[PDB]
Amino acid sequence: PKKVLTGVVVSDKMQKTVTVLVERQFPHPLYGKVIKRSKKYLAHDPEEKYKLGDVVEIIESRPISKRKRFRVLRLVESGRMDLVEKYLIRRQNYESLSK
Amino acid sequence: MVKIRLARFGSKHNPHYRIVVTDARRKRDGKYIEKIGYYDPRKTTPDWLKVDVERARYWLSVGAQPTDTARRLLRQAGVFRQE
Amino acid sequence: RNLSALKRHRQSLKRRLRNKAKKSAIKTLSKKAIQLAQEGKAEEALKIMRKAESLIDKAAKGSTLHKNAAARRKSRLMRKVRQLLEAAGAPLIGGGLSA
Amino acid sequence: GRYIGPVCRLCRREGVKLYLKGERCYSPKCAMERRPYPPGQHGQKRARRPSDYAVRLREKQKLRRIYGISERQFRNLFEEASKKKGVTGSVFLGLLESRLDNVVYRLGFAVSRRQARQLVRHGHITVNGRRVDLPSYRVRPGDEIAVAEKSRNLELIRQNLEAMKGRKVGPWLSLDVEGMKGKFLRLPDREDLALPVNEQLVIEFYSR
RNA sequence: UGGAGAGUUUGAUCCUGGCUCAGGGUGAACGCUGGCGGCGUGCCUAAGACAUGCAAGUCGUGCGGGCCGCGGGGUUUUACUCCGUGGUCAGCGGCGGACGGGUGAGUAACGCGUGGGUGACCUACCCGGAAGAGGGGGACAACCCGGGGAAACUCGGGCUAAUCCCCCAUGUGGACCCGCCCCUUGGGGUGUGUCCAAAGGGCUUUGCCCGCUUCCGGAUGGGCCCGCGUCCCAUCAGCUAGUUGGUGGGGUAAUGGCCCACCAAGGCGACGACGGGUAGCCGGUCUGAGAGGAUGGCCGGCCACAGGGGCACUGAGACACGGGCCCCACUCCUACGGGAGGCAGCAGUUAGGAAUCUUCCGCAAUGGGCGCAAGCCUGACGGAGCGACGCCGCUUGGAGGAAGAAGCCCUUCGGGGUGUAAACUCCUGAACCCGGGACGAAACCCCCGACGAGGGGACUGACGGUACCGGGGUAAUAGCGCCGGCCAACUCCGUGCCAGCAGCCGCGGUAAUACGGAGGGCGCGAGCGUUACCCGGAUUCACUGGGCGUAAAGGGCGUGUAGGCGGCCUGGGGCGUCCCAUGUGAAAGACCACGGCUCAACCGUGGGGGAGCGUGGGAUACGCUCAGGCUAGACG
């Protein structure tokens, strides 16, 4: 079966493309704590249908381009900008630690 | 092509063969598709030759080609017997 | 002091000159046909596209222009010709293109 | 190697009368009957309180030198027993008693275990009919240990099986004296063996 | 069925704490010593350089010839020529050279492991099914002639065959554009239009065999894509210009920014990008109570590479180890113009290094390529050789033998020790000497049958006169370390902080169980020690399993970002969590049972397993999320 993930659209700045951040929980292999990792996937939106904040499902697809290997299956729930704000804050914190 | 042949598994001066289905290109002791029997040339035990008949019939139906020795061993096990 | 498998090498050279020839024809004819489709001459364009398709398939007979790469070339050729004729119209000779 | 050399010096060093010569360890000539102290210049001197390692090492050396088995085969048999299910000590003793040379000694074919080793090594012993010349051969319950028909006319076998008339054999062994053969009935229990050795000390010695 | 500790800081103690030792392991090496056999194993360094031989070919049942020879013909003879045949040589043509074999360089990466996707794909030979093969035409080698070059080799002209190339036809069918239907990414069907097939050979000769062509499917093998996992350094913090995306193209069997035009300004990063370093990865292996640590040699799977770098051709398949082209370094030939070569294939040479083998036998067995077959090729492989390198089996004798030879060492001078040890007595018979003497090998093939099933017959052994069996038959290698404590084993003499020992504590400066020798003893034994390295002890990087008042260790303090953590009640969801079924978890190894070499090592068979991940279903206590409510926390 083609893998199906669920994430948040955090970048609509590309043409016919979205950036879906997908989280996942798993116990640490040695320390057993349930830790939360995350990964961004470039998903294909051929109709510019999905916008920022939309929580969507993502399906493994025939490759559309380099780095782009997934399509947007459906919209789970409409825009919730809280997670997008969290991601943008986590990104903006990188400018504080340079030198 | 896919062939039915013998793989050597015994020690030195103690040959023990596995009647085995594998691609002809892979080495004779390499990863085979399925073990369909075993053969002991020195007849050390009362059961020195065993063959899965239905599996051999299947692999012959799909187009495997046994070696002359493999064909001899299969014929001795009644794989081709249609009486 | 070497082995006679150099014969193979010789053969390859011949086959090279055999393949490069056929392709060199096909491409050429293709261009020609496309030109006649851009300029509106429909009967001549299709009459040449027929020969181009014939050469493509005849090269597919051998090891020169073998499996469905030949269908790729035929598809692209016929698509481009039908598209360029739609800019002018009147598919006169009614050759490779279906009704 | 089999340690080959003086034997009753081990009768002395081990502190317990061993039977490595067969006879003459029963006669008042074992040198353990008349010299019970350990060998060497410092044998008669007052012994110091030995360490625990000393006790365990001496016990294991007693148990090993009783059978005349090298340290290699001894450690291998011990590890083999420890791998098996059951009490390590009793299984180890049953393995040691299952050796072909020890079975020959127990059946009275030889007066000593080393004489039994020489009898086996020279092909004078058959197992189930087939000649076997390996002292390390393991006897299974049900095997018939016999004397070679070509060797039954030798003087030593005549003497040994002429003295075995009326003598009893171990509970796990049977003996046909006229046919010069015997059977290994079962593995011997710890109660069946009269060995002056504490097996738990040897287990603790290899536990280190 | 699984877990041992000890020595050492002090005058003594407790604690903290490091160091060291007892264990196991090795592709080992070195010293002393060294008898046999079986099974394994053997360049870890210079991915340095290589003399020589072999290692990849095969088909006359695809085709025409050259050379040498024989036989029979057309002729009265000659000249000339026709046919058959033998040997040989290449050539054209087909298949194979992309497998097998080697190595660990490079790679931190979809390379590998694992689980999936391909509606985005290919697969020569093989298997099943449907259909077909009609006619014509052409060229290049071999060969003949001439030229150029020292050579490698090369250039031009002419003749010719084919399963070589081409044209037309036949359209079972397939390919493509467009339209419709089903299906849902490029899957399947249908219509018109267009385009596309073929090769013959052999006979036991008008009937079969090897083939050929188009298509569908199977099988096998692979390409590509995705989730998760995969070392150290943050004394590397910002990285990116084909960079991220789009449109349209080119390209491939196929998706793709793979490549290219034009357009948009994006993409990645403390959840560690980028950079540096190191390193093939895994099944496994070593160790460990386990968790874990270390490792990836032999064998098996995948990868990458073939003097260094780059590139295409041919082909089903290669960016091709023993194919091609160019640049670079090196070696060789050279008429100085120019050429030849590429052991990380087998063996061997040399260099480096502490260190790693025979320039061996064989096509008998297994496997592979070609061939209808006979058969040819195969340094794949099967064996032998060398090396205690490892594992296992075995021998150097067995029994009797003094209140106890001699010698040697102690000594209270009474004696004690080496010690039943020896000499000796009797017995067996390692070595060797003879005779027999293998299994591994029955198929391919031939005959009957029907070239099927079935039956029958025949050939073929490198190892090797080896294994093994029978007879005969000689008492016939023992060494190495240690003896102060950890740690099993004590005396004498010599030496005098000298000579030296030492893993740690430490010993020796006159009477040393510690140095050296002797006697004796302890431990192993064809081995014993040493060194190196790995795990162990080590709970000493503490998940299981540690700590921070004074022993190493709380940041000088606050505010607060990300993150981590979250009071009580009800409900929905079922992400974590849990359960059932199922798929996967190759083989070998590991575990258990039985069995084969006289045992064992080694090996065969069978059984049992198993974390993880995919799928279907279920559970909702807790963690999570959403919605509502409460006031004990918090704030006012």
Ligand SMILES: [K+]
């Ligand atoms: K920035």
Ligand SMILES: [K+]
């Ligand atoms: K102390």
Ligand SMILES: [K+]
């Ligand atoms: K020519």
Ligand SMILES: [K+]
């Ligand atoms: K049609």
Ligand SMILES: [K+]
């Ligand atoms: K397939």
Ligand SMILES: [K+]
């Ligand atoms: K090649």
Ligand SMILES: [K+]
């Ligand atoms: K005899």
Ligand SMILES: [K+]
């Ligand atoms: K037959």
Ligand SMILES: [K+]
């Ligand atoms: K004999």
Ligand SMILES: [K+]
């Ligand atoms: K001196």
Ligand SMILES: [K+]
């Ligand atoms: K000394």
Ligand SMILES: [K+]
């Ligand atoms: K754990």
Ligand SMILES: [Mg+2]
């Ligand atoms: Mg999410």
Ligand SMILES: [Mg+2]
């Ligand atoms: Mg957008």
Ligand SMILES: [Mg+2]
């Ligand atoms: Mg695109």
Ligand SMILES: [Mg+2]
């Ligand atoms: Mg293969």
